[PDB]
Design a protein around this nucleic acid. Structure first.
Ligand SMILES: NC(=[NH2+])NCCCO
Lengths: 215, 209
DNA sequence: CTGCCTCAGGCAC
DNA sequence: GTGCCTGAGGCAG
Protein backbone atom coordinates (compact mmCIF):
# COMPACT_ATOMS: atom_id res chain seq x y z
CA UNK A 1 0.00 0.00 0.00
CA UNK A 2 0.89 3.71 -0.80
CA UNK A 3 2.61 5.85 1.86
CA UNK A 4 -0.09 7.98 3.53
CA UNK A 5 0.18 11.33 1.63
CA UNK A 6 0.05 13.19 5.02
CA UNK A 7 3.45 11.54 5.86
CA UNK A 8 5.06 12.44 2.47
CA UNK A 9 6.91 15.78 2.42
CA UNK A 10 7.58 15.91 -1.39
CA UNK A 11 8.73 13.79 -4.41
CA UNK A 12 12.25 14.29 -5.83
CA UNK A 13 13.58 13.29 -9.29
CA UNK A 14 16.63 10.99 -9.04
CA UNK A 15 20.05 12.68 -9.70
CA UNK A 16 21.52 9.51 -11.35
CA UNK A 17 18.64 8.43 -13.69
CA UNK A 18 19.18 8.58 -17.50
CA UNK A 19 16.17 9.33 -19.77
CA UNK A 20 13.43 9.35 -17.04
CA UNK A 21 14.31 5.70 -16.07
CA UNK A 22 12.81 6.16 -12.49
CA UNK A 23 9.63 7.70 -10.95
CA UNK A 24 10.24 10.59 -8.57
CA UNK A 25 11.33 9.27 -5.15
CA UNK A 26 8.91 10.03 -2.30
CA UNK A 27 10.58 11.86 0.56
CA UNK A 28 8.76 11.15 3.87
CA UNK A 29 8.53 13.58 6.76
CA UNK A 30 10.55 10.89 8.73
CA UNK A 31 13.39 11.27 6.12
CA UNK A 32 13.31 15.10 6.37
CA UNK A 33 13.49 14.82 10.21
CA UNK A 34 16.55 12.47 9.85
CA UNK A 35 18.32 15.12 7.69
CA UNK A 36 17.48 18.01 10.16
CA UNK A 37 18.52 16.01 13.29
CA UNK A 38 22.01 14.96 14.54
CA UNK A 39 24.35 13.88 13.23
CA UNK A 40 24.01 15.98 10.02
CA UNK A 41 21.64 18.85 11.17
CA UNK A 42 21.28 20.16 7.58
CA UNK A 43 20.17 23.82 7.22
CA UNK A 44 17.50 25.17 4.81
CA UNK A 45 19.97 25.70 1.99
CA UNK A 46 21.47 22.13 2.11
CA UNK A 47 18.01 20.53 2.56
CA UNK A 48 16.75 22.56 -0.46
CA UNK A 49 19.50 20.98 -2.60
CA UNK A 50 18.69 17.47 -1.28
CA UNK A 51 15.01 18.16 -2.22
CA UNK A 52 16.20 19.67 -5.55
CA UNK A 53 14.16 22.93 -5.06
CA UNK A 54 14.58 26.13 -7.21
CA UNK A 55 16.73 28.80 -5.41
CA UNK A 56 13.97 31.45 -5.71
CA UNK A 57 13.63 34.71 -3.67
CA UNK A 58 12.78 33.77 -0.02
CA UNK A 59 13.23 30.05 -1.00
CA UNK A 60 14.66 29.39 2.51
CA UNK A 61 11.66 31.10 4.23
CA UNK A 62 9.14 29.19 2.13
CA UNK A 63 10.93 25.82 2.94
CA UNK A 64 11.07 26.68 6.70
CA UNK A 65 7.30 27.53 6.58
CA UNK A 66 6.54 24.18 4.87
CA UNK A 67 8.57 22.47 7.68
CA UNK A 68 6.69 24.44 10.43
CA UNK A 69 3.28 23.24 9.05
CA UNK A 70 4.38 19.55 9.65
CA UNK A 71 5.83 20.37 13.13
CA UNK A 72 9.61 20.46 12.29
CA UNK A 73 11.46 23.59 13.49
CA UNK A 74 14.44 24.66 11.31
CA UNK A 75 16.02 27.92 12.66
CA UNK A 76 16.91 30.46 9.92
CA UNK A 77 20.40 30.91 11.49
CA UNK A 78 21.40 27.19 11.64
CA UNK A 79 25.12 26.75 10.68
CA UNK A 80 25.99 25.28 7.21
CA UNK A 81 27.50 21.72 7.66
CA UNK A 82 31.00 21.60 6.02
CA UNK A 83 31.39 17.70 6.39
CA UNK A 84 29.02 17.11 3.41
CA UNK A 85 29.95 14.37 0.90
CA UNK A 86 28.53 13.40 -2.49
CA UNK A 87 26.28 10.92 -0.51
CA UNK A 88 24.70 13.92 1.35
CA UNK A 89 23.03 14.94 -1.98
CA UNK A 90 20.96 11.71 -2.16
CA UNK A 91 17.33 11.10 -1.10
CA UNK A 92 17.10 7.77 0.76
CA UNK A 93 15.22 6.00 -2.09
CA UNK A 94 18.03 6.88 -4.55
CA UNK A 95 20.79 6.01 -2.04
CA UNK A 96 19.32 2.54 -1.56
CA UNK A 97 18.73 2.17 -5.34
CA UNK A 98 22.41 3.13 -5.94
CA UNK A 99 23.54 0.47 -3.41
CA UNK A 100 21.26 -2.14 -5.12
CA UNK A 101 22.77 -1.34 -8.57
CA UNK A 102 26.30 -1.57 -7.00
CA UNK A 103 25.24 -5.02 -5.66
CA UNK A 104 24.00 -5.93 -9.16
CA UNK A 105 27.32 -4.96 -10.93
CA UNK A 106 29.39 -6.69 -8.16
CA UNK A 107 27.28 -9.89 -8.75
CA UNK A 108 27.04 -9.79 -12.59
CA UNK A 109 30.04 -7.78 -13.92
CA UNK A 110 32.88 -8.14 -11.32
CA UNK A 111 35.32 -10.71 -12.89
CA UNK A 112 35.51 -12.98 -9.77
CA UNK A 113 36.77 -16.03 -11.76
CA UNK A 114 39.62 -14.13 -13.54
CA UNK A 115 40.65 -12.52 -10.19
CA UNK A 116 40.60 -16.00 -8.46
CA UNK A 117 42.79 -17.50 -11.25
CA UNK A 118 45.25 -14.61 -11.04
CA UNK A 119 45.56 -14.58 -7.24
CA UNK A 120 45.69 -18.47 -7.02
CA UNK A 121 48.66 -18.24 -9.54
CA UNK A 122 50.52 -15.78 -7.25
CA UNK A 123 50.36 -18.47 -4.44
CA UNK A 124 50.68 -21.65 -6.49
CA UNK A 125 53.60 -23.51 -4.73
CA UNK A 126 52.45 -27.04 -3.71
CA UNK A 127 53.72 -26.39 -0.16
CA UNK A 128 51.23 -23.46 0.43
CA UNK A 129 48.00 -24.95 -1.06
CA UNK A 130 46.63 -26.38 2.23
CA UNK A 131 47.28 -23.07 4.10
CA UNK A 132 45.78 -20.97 1.19
CA UNK A 133 42.59 -23.16 1.18
CA UNK A 134 42.15 -22.74 4.99
CA UNK A 135 42.79 -18.95 4.72
CA UNK A 136 40.13 -18.67 1.92
CA UNK A 137 37.63 -20.71 4.03
CA UNK A 138 38.26 -18.58 7.18
CA UNK A 139 37.90 -15.35 5.07
CA UNK A 140 34.49 -16.60 3.75
CA UNK A 141 33.29 -17.34 7.29
CA UNK A 142 34.48 -14.05 8.87
CA UNK A 143 33.06 -11.99 5.89
CA UNK A 144 29.67 -13.79 6.15
CA UNK A 145 29.42 -13.13 9.93
CA UNK A 146 30.24 -9.42 9.21
CA UNK A 147 27.57 -9.05 6.41
CA UNK A 148 25.03 -11.08 8.55
CA UNK A 149 25.40 -8.43 11.29
CA UNK A 150 24.93 -5.57 8.75
CA UNK A 151 21.80 -7.41 7.37
CA UNK A 152 20.27 -7.28 10.91
CA UNK A 153 20.40 -3.41 10.86
CA UNK A 154 16.81 -2.11 11.42
CA UNK A 155 17.59 1.64 10.96
CA UNK A 156 14.47 3.65 10.02
CA UNK A 157 14.34 4.29 6.20
CA UNK A 158 11.46 5.65 4.04
CA UNK A 159 8.25 5.47 6.09
CA UNK A 160 9.30 2.30 8.00
CA UNK A 161 10.38 2.10 11.67
CA UNK A 162 10.76 -1.69 12.13
CA UNK A 163 11.27 -3.26 15.62
CA UNK A 164 15.04 -3.67 16.26
CA UNK A 165 16.42 -7.27 16.42
CA UNK A 166 19.92 -6.09 17.62
CA UNK A 167 20.70 -4.69 21.13
CA UNK A 168 20.42 -0.88 21.31
CA UNK A 169 24.21 -0.16 21.53
CA UNK A 170 25.26 -1.82 18.20
CA UNK A 171 21.90 -0.68 16.56
CA UNK A 172 22.67 3.01 17.40
CA UNK A 173 26.17 2.57 15.83
CA UNK A 174 24.72 1.06 12.60
CA UNK A 175 22.04 3.80 12.57
CA UNK A 176 24.82 6.43 12.74
CA UNK A 177 26.32 4.95 9.51
CA UNK A 178 22.77 4.86 7.92
CA UNK A 179 22.20 8.59 8.74
CA UNK A 180 25.53 9.97 7.38
CA UNK A 181 25.22 7.85 4.15
CA UNK A 182 21.39 8.34 3.69
CA UNK A 183 20.99 4.54 3.71
CA UNK A 184 23.71 3.80 1.09
CA UNK A 185 26.43 2.72 3.57
CA UNK A 186 25.66 -0.76 5.01
CA UNK A 187 24.09 -2.10 1.77
CA UNK A 188 27.00 -0.76 -0.37
CA UNK A 189 29.50 -2.44 2.02
CA UNK A 190 27.47 -5.76 1.67
CA UNK A 191 27.43 -5.24 -2.16
CA UNK A 192 31.26 -4.98 -2.27
CA UNK A 193 31.68 -7.99 0.06
CA UNK A 194 29.65 -10.06 -2.49
CA UNK A 195 32.43 -9.38 -5.06
CA UNK A 196 35.02 -10.54 -2.45
CA UNK A 197 32.83 -13.60 -1.54
CA UNK A 198 32.50 -14.51 -5.29
CA UNK A 199 36.34 -14.27 -5.62
CA UNK A 200 36.77 -16.59 -2.58
CA UNK A 201 34.20 -19.11 -4.02
CA UNK A 202 35.87 -19.04 -7.46
CA UNK A 203 39.37 -19.35 -5.84
CA UNK A 204 38.33 -22.46 -3.82
CA UNK A 205 36.59 -23.93 -6.92
CA UNK A 206 39.68 -23.40 -9.18
CA UNK A 207 41.89 -25.16 -6.51
CA UNK A 208 39.34 -28.07 -6.30
CA UNK A 209 39.25 -28.35 -10.12
CA UNK A 210 42.97 -27.72 -10.77
CA UNK A 211 43.45 -31.20 -12.34
CA UNK A 212 40.54 -30.93 -14.84
CA UNK A 213 41.56 -27.27 -15.65
CA UNK A 214 45.11 -28.42 -16.75
CA UNK A 215 43.24 -31.54 -18.33
CA UNK B 1 44.17 18.49 -19.95
CA UNK B 2 44.97 19.90 -23.44
CA UNK B 3 41.77 21.77 -24.54
CA UNK B 4 41.97 19.84 -27.93
CA UNK B 5 41.27 16.61 -25.90
CA UNK B 6 38.27 18.10 -23.91
CA UNK B 7 34.87 17.33 -25.47
CA UNK B 8 32.91 19.31 -22.83
CA UNK B 9 32.64 20.11 -19.12
CA UNK B 10 29.75 18.66 -17.04
CA UNK B 11 28.49 19.77 -13.61
CA UNK B 12 28.49 16.96 -11.03
CA UNK B 13 25.17 15.19 -10.38
CA UNK B 14 25.88 14.71 -6.63
CA UNK B 15 27.16 18.22 -5.58
CA UNK B 16 25.21 20.41 -3.05
CA UNK B 17 25.41 24.27 -3.31
CA UNK B 18 28.10 24.59 -6.08
CA UNK B 19 30.59 22.55 -3.91
CA UNK B 20 32.52 21.19 -7.03
CA UNK B 21 33.84 22.75 -10.32
CA UNK B 22 32.46 21.16 -13.54
CA UNK B 23 34.16 17.83 -14.55
CA UNK B 24 36.12 17.73 -17.81
CA UNK B 25 34.96 14.98 -20.16
CA UNK B 26 37.72 14.03 -22.66
CA UNK B 27 37.41 12.61 -26.16
CA UNK B 28 38.97 9.37 -24.75
CA UNK B 29 36.14 9.11 -22.15
CA UNK B 30 33.45 9.68 -24.87
CA UNK B 31 35.13 7.02 -27.05
CA UNK B 32 34.92 4.55 -24.10
CA UNK B 33 31.13 5.31 -23.72
CA UNK B 34 30.56 4.78 -27.50
CA UNK B 35 32.53 1.47 -27.69
CA UNK B 36 31.82 -2.05 -26.31
CA UNK B 37 30.66 -3.10 -23.84
CA UNK B 38 28.16 -0.22 -23.40
CA UNK B 39 27.88 1.33 -26.95
CA UNK B 40 25.76 4.28 -25.69
CA UNK B 41 23.69 6.03 -28.37
CA UNK B 42 23.13 9.82 -28.86
CA UNK B 43 20.23 9.96 -26.36
CA UNK B 44 22.07 8.10 -23.48
CA UNK B 45 25.38 9.94 -24.13
CA UNK B 46 23.43 13.27 -24.19
CA UNK B 47 22.18 12.34 -20.69
CA UNK B 48 25.71 11.43 -19.44
CA UNK B 49 26.90 14.87 -20.78
CA UNK B 50 23.83 16.62 -19.13
CA UNK B 51 22.75 18.26 -22.47
CA UNK B 52 19.29 19.77 -23.19
CA UNK B 53 16.79 17.41 -24.91
CA UNK B 54 16.16 19.65 -27.98
CA UNK B 55 14.56 18.96 -31.37
CA UNK B 56 17.20 16.95 -33.32
CA UNK B 57 19.62 17.28 -30.30
CA UNK B 58 20.79 13.75 -31.28
CA UNK B 59 21.85 15.13 -34.69
CA UNK B 60 23.84 18.02 -33.14
CA UNK B 61 25.69 15.67 -30.74
CA UNK B 62 26.40 13.19 -33.61
CA UNK B 63 27.82 16.08 -35.76
CA UNK B 64 29.92 17.34 -32.78
CA UNK B 65 31.30 13.73 -32.39
CA UNK B 66 32.04 13.37 -36.16
CA UNK B 67 34.14 16.61 -36.04
CA UNK B 68 36.46 15.16 -33.30
CA UNK B 69 36.70 11.83 -35.21
CA UNK B 70 34.10 9.62 -33.35
CA UNK B 71 31.38 7.94 -35.51
CA UNK B 72 27.97 7.56 -33.76
CA UNK B 73 25.26 6.26 -36.17
CA UNK B 74 21.69 7.75 -35.99
CA UNK B 75 20.18 4.23 -35.80
CA UNK B 76 22.18 2.91 -32.80
CA UNK B 77 19.85 1.11 -30.31
CA UNK B 78 19.81 1.93 -26.58
CA UNK B 79 22.37 -0.02 -24.48
CA UNK B 80 21.31 -3.41 -23.08
CA UNK B 81 22.71 -2.77 -19.51
CA UNK B 82 22.03 0.69 -17.86
CA UNK B 83 22.38 1.30 -14.06
CA UNK B 84 22.58 4.50 -12.01
CA UNK B 85 26.40 4.23 -12.48
CA UNK B 86 25.88 4.68 -16.28
CA UNK B 87 24.87 8.34 -15.63
CA UNK B 88 28.31 9.25 -14.18
CA UNK B 89 31.20 11.07 -15.86
CA UNK B 90 34.51 9.26 -14.96
CA UNK B 91 35.72 12.15 -12.77
CA UNK B 92 32.56 12.07 -10.56
CA UNK B 93 32.58 8.23 -10.50
CA UNK B 94 36.13 8.25 -9.09
CA UNK B 95 35.31 11.15 -6.73
CA UNK B 96 32.19 9.21 -5.46
CA UNK B 97 34.34 6.07 -4.79
CA UNK B 98 36.89 8.20 -2.83
CA UNK B 99 33.98 9.73 -0.83
CA UNK B 100 32.68 6.18 -0.08
CA UNK B 101 36.24 5.31 1.09
CA UNK B 102 36.27 8.48 3.29
CA UNK B 103 32.91 7.60 4.99
CA UNK B 104 34.01 3.95 5.49
CA UNK B 105 37.24 5.23 7.15
CA UNK B 106 35.63 8.02 9.27
CA UNK B 107 32.01 6.93 10.03
CA UNK B 108 31.81 3.11 9.87
CA UNK B 109 31.60 1.89 13.53
CA UNK B 110 34.50 -0.63 13.25
CA UNK B 111 35.17 -0.68 17.02
CA UNK B 112 31.50 -1.24 18.06
CA UNK B 113 31.16 -3.94 15.36
CA UNK B 114 34.41 -5.65 16.60
CA UNK B 115 33.25 -5.57 20.31
CA UNK B 116 29.87 -7.01 19.29
CA UNK B 117 31.18 -9.81 17.01
CA UNK B 118 34.03 -10.79 19.52
CA UNK B 119 31.31 -11.10 22.23
CA UNK B 120 29.51 -13.72 20.06
CA UNK B 121 32.72 -15.88 20.47
CA UNK B 122 33.58 -15.71 24.21
CA UNK B 123 34.50 -19.48 24.70
CA UNK B 124 38.06 -19.23 26.14
CA UNK B 125 39.08 -22.30 24.00
CA UNK B 126 38.17 -20.69 20.58
CA UNK B 127 40.13 -17.38 20.97
CA UNK B 128 43.30 -18.69 19.22
CA UNK B 129 41.07 -20.04 16.38
CA UNK B 130 39.15 -16.69 16.10
CA UNK B 131 42.45 -14.70 16.13
CA UNK B 132 43.89 -16.80 13.25
CA UNK B 133 40.60 -16.52 11.26
CA UNK B 134 40.78 -12.67 11.64
CA UNK B 135 44.49 -12.54 10.64
CA UNK B 136 43.79 -14.83 7.64
CA UNK B 137 40.89 -12.53 6.55
CA UNK B 138 43.12 -9.35 6.82
CA UNK B 139 45.80 -10.98 4.62
CA UNK B 140 43.42 -12.43 1.93
CA UNK B 141 41.49 -9.08 1.71
CA UNK B 142 44.77 -7.15 1.42
CA UNK B 143 46.03 -9.35 -1.50
CA UNK B 144 42.57 -8.85 -3.15
CA UNK B 145 42.61 -5.01 -2.83
CA UNK B 146 46.36 -4.92 -3.80
CA UNK B 147 45.36 -6.60 -7.10
CA UNK B 148 42.52 -4.03 -7.69
CA UNK B 149 45.04 -1.19 -6.93
CA UNK B 150 47.29 -2.46 -9.83
CA UNK B 151 44.41 -1.79 -12.33
CA UNK B 152 45.79 0.61 -15.05
CA UNK B 153 42.48 0.89 -17.02
CA UNK B 154 42.38 4.16 -19.01
CA UNK B 155 40.33 6.95 -17.29
CA UNK B 156 40.03 10.62 -18.24
CA UNK B 157 42.91 11.53 -20.58
CA UNK B 158 45.28 8.94 -18.84
CA UNK B 159 46.51 5.79 -20.61
CA UNK B 160 49.26 4.46 -18.30
CA UNK B 161 51.36 1.38 -19.27
CA UNK B 162 49.78 -1.70 -17.65
CA UNK B 163 51.72 -3.41 -14.79
CA UNK B 164 49.42 -6.51 -14.90
CA UNK B 165 49.36 -9.12 -17.70
CA UNK B 166 46.85 -8.47 -20.51
CA UNK B 167 44.32 -11.25 -19.51
CA UNK B 168 43.54 -10.00 -15.95
CA UNK B 169 43.89 -6.34 -17.16
CA UNK B 170 41.13 -6.83 -19.83
CA UNK B 171 38.78 -8.36 -17.15
CA UNK B 172 39.48 -5.42 -14.71
CA UNK B 173 38.97 -2.95 -17.68
CA UNK B 174 35.54 -4.58 -18.31
CA UNK B 175 34.48 -3.73 -14.69
CA UNK B 176 35.93 -0.18 -15.15
CA UNK B 177 33.93 0.44 -18.39
CA UNK B 178 30.49 -0.69 -17.04
CA UNK B 179 31.04 1.30 -13.76
CA UNK B 180 32.67 4.41 -15.43
CA UNK B 181 35.58 3.94 -13.03
CA UNK B 182 33.57 3.61 -9.80
CA UNK B 183 33.72 -0.21 -9.42
CA UNK B 184 37.22 -1.28 -8.27
CA UNK B 185 37.88 1.76 -6.02
CA UNK B 186 34.37 1.36 -4.47
CA UNK B 187 35.10 -2.35 -3.70
CA UNK B 188 38.43 -1.16 -2.11
CA UNK B 189 36.54 1.56 -0.14
CA UNK B 190 34.12 -1.04 1.33
CA UNK B 191 36.96 -3.49 2.26
CA UNK B 192 38.39 -0.54 4.37
CA UNK B 193 35.32 -0.90 6.66
CA UNK B 194 36.01 -4.70 6.84
CA UNK B 195 39.80 -4.16 7.45
CA UNK B 196 39.09 -1.59 10.28
CA UNK B 197 36.66 -4.10 11.93
CA UNK B 198 39.35 -6.87 11.73
CA UNK B 199 41.98 -4.47 13.16
CA UNK B 200 39.67 -3.41 16.05
CA UNK B 201 38.65 -7.07 16.72
CA UNK B 202 42.35 -8.22 16.98
CA UNK B 203 43.18 -5.18 19.20
CA UNK B 204 40.18 -5.88 21.55
CA UNK B 205 41.21 -9.60 21.78
CA UNK B 206 44.86 -8.64 22.64
CA UNK B 207 43.60 -6.15 25.33
CA UNK B 208 41.45 -8.99 26.93
CA UNK B 209 44.62 -11.21 26.91
C1' DC C 1 10.16 7.69 -26.75
C1' DT C 2 10.38 12.93 -28.38
C1' DG C 3 11.16 17.41 -27.31
C1' DC C 4 8.56 21.78 -25.19
C1' DC C 5 8.49 24.77 -21.72
C1' DT C 6 8.79 24.52 -16.41
C1' DC C 7 11.75 25.29 -12.90
C1' DA C 8 16.53 23.47 -10.94
C1' DG C 9 20.66 25.30 -10.06
C1' DG C 10 25.01 27.42 -12.31
C1' DC C 11 26.60 31.48 -11.74
C1' DA C 12 27.64 36.53 -10.36
C1' DC C 13 27.92 39.15 -6.68
C1' DG D 1 24.66 33.56 1.29
C1' DT D 2 21.09 35.26 -2.09
C1' DG D 3 18.43 34.71 -5.94
C1' DC D 4 18.36 35.82 -11.37
C1' DC D 5 17.89 33.95 -15.55
C1' DT D 6 20.15 30.16 -18.56
C1' DG D 7 19.40 25.77 -20.19
C1' DA D 8 18.77 20.60 -18.27
C1' DG D 9 15.43 17.56 -18.10
C1' DG D 10 10.61 16.42 -16.11
C1' DC D 11 6.72 15.57 -17.92
C1' DA D 12 3.10 15.73 -21.30
C1' DG D 13 1.65 13.27 -24.84
N1 LIG E 1 27.35 18.59 10.62
C1 LIG E 1 27.15 19.63 11.41
N2 LIG E 1 27.03 19.42 12.71
N3 LIG E 1 27.11 20.87 10.91
C2 LIG E 1 26.65 22.06 11.60
C3 LIG E 1 25.17 21.92 11.89
C4 LIG E 1 24.49 23.21 12.30
O1 LIG E 1 24.18 23.19 13.71
Amino acid sequence: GVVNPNEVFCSVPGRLSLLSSTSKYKVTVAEVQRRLSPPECLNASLLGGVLRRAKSKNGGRSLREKLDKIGLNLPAGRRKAANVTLLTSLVEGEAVHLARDFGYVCETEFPAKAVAEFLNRQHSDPNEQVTRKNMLLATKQICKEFTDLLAQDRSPLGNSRPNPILEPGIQSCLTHFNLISHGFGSPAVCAAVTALQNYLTEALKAMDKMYLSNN
